[PDB]
Design a protein around this ligand. Structure first.
Ligand SMILES: *[C@@H]1O[C@H](CO)[C@@H](O)[C@H](O)[C@H]1NC(C)=O
Ligand SMILES: *[C@H]1O[C@H](CO)[C@@H](O)[C@H](O)[C@H]1NC(C)=O
Ligand SMILES: [Cl-]
Ligand SMILES: [Cl-]
Ligand SMILES: [Cl-]
Ligand SMILES: [Cl-]
Ligand SMILES: [Cl-]
Ligand SMILES: [Cl-]
Ligand SMILES: [Cl-]
Ligand SMILES: [Cl-]
Ligand SMILES: [Cl-]
Ligand SMILES: [Cl-]
Ligand SMILES: [Cl-]
Ligand SMILES: [Cl-]
Ligand SMILES: [Cl-]
Ligand SMILES: [Cl-]
Ligand SMILES: [Cl-]
Ligand SMILES: [Cl-]
Ligand SMILES: [Cl-]
Ligand code: NA
Length: 359
């Protein structure tokens, strides 16, 4: 019978996932392809251990798709996953963690997809939140983290052509390497500040700003889902009164994300088998790649891109982000815990507070 080998790699998760033994030879939601899911749990959590582990695994076993989750703030994992996907022409889904943090510079040949919001979609949500409370005067601070230009250009885009009273005061670009930063942050006027950067960079940028008094009352910082990250890990240096977009497993838990990864890869193999009477072979080397099986791969990609499952639209954009994620807006409260203050689902923002709290 027709069957696709899928690997599920969970990395540093307290969260527990249980999947049918592959030996069951059991169909998955009536799809014509039968998944052979290999669960792999990882004790180790550094990028090097992960490439070593995933590559060893493609060499040793017959894998044609990879579902990957991690519980860390290590965006670097997304770089590794992209490379591997490109090298092997295998679909790789980054369903949670550092693996799903926005990666702007994806190889156009990789079939690496991330769950959650594109960089633009988050820029858009950030402006939605600000309009819902007539926060119209604001500044942007970014680092050099890839995506930063796509961030600003999306703000400037939606702002320049609209008859709302938007006013972009300053736009900063920070160099994280050495304190000539202090002099740049000191130049910040506006009460709303949009910050694009990494969790790591954020925690240092805050500490500096905390000590220029651009934190606290009268200043609101809005930040992208990667800066929140693992919401159980809150840097001492993050200011209470911090708003962030987020996708850190509030309503959509790991087992549901894994179920969904399997469905995407398995629907795609099914739809392709339907039309072309065949399915891409397993590639077995991240490195020594005789891999000019390029025509086949490209074909799969048309299908991964458009999957729909249990009524959910799981389709992906060209840049490799999820088209329609259901996001949560969160707030860093006085007890220094992240708190739900909103929701978003197909251009519909539902905020929780009537008057914005004082934190
Ligand atoms: C993919 O999306 C298009 C356009 O919205 C749709 O019409 C098409 O039938 C989809 N394919 C599947 C298998 O749903
Ligand atoms: C695997 O994880 C740790 C540290 O990475 C290791 O040292 C340890 O021996 C392993 N887990 C257990 C329960 O021993
Ligand atoms: Cl391991
Ligand atoms: Cl981490
Ligand atoms: Cl996520
Ligand atoms: Cl993100
Ligand atoms: Cl984008
Ligand atoms: Cl950029
Ligand atoms: Cl730019
Ligand atoms: Cl700088
Ligand atoms: Cl501090
Ligand atoms: Cl969620
Ligand atoms: Cl579930
Ligand atoms: Cl299921
Ligand atoms: Cl190899
Ligand atoms: Cl082509
Ligand atoms: Cl509180
Ligand atoms: Cl909450
Ligand atoms: Cl709400
Ligand atoms: Na994401």
């Amino acid at each position: 019978p027709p069957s696709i080998g899928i690997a599920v790699i969970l990395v540093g998760t307290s969260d527990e996932v249980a999947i049918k033994d592959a030996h069951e030879k059991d169909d998955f939601h009536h799809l014509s392809v039968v998944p052979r899911v290999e669960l792999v749990a990882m004790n180790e959590t550094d990028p090097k251990s992960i490439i070593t582990r995933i590559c060893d695994l493609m060499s040793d076993r017959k894998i044609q798709g990879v579902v990957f989750a991690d519980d860390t703030d290590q965006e670097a994992i997304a770089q590794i996953l992209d490379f591997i996907s490109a090298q092997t022409l295998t679909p790789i889904l980054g369903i949670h963690g550092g693996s799903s943090m926005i990666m702007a510079d994806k190889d156009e040949s990789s079939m690496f997809f991330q769950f959650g919001p594109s960089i633009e979609q988050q820029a858009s949500v950030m402006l939605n939140i600000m309009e819902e409370y007539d926060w119209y005067i604001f500044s942007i601070v970014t680092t050099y983290f890839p995506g930063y230009q796509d961030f600003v250009n999306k703000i400037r885009s939606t702002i320049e052509n609209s008859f709302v009273g938007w006013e972009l005061e300053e736009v900063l670009l920070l160099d994280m390497s050495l304190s000539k930063i202090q002099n740049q942050l000191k130049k910040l006027q506006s009460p709303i500040i949009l910050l694009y950067c990494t969790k790591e960079e954020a925690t240092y940028i805050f500490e500096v700003a905390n000590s220029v008094g651009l934190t606290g009352y009268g200043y609101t910082w809005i930040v992208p889902s990667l800066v929140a990250g693992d919401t159980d890990t809150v840097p001492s240096e993050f200011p209470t009164g911090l708003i962030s977009v987020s996708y850190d497993e509030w309503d959509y838990g790991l087992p549901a994300r894994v179920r969904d990864g399997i469905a995407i890869i398995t629907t795609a193999a099914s739809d392709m088998l339907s039309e072309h009477s065949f399915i891409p072979e397993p590639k077995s080397s991240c490195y020594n790649t005789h891999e000019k099986r390029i025509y086949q791969s490209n074909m799969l990609n048309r299908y991964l891109i458009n999957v729909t499952f249990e009524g959910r639209d799981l389709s992906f954009s060209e840049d490799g982000y999820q088209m329609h994620p259901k996001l949560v807006i969160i707030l860093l409260n006085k007890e220094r815990k992240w708190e739900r203050v909103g929701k978003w689902k197909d251009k519909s923002l539902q905020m929780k507070y009537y008057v914005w709290p004082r934190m």
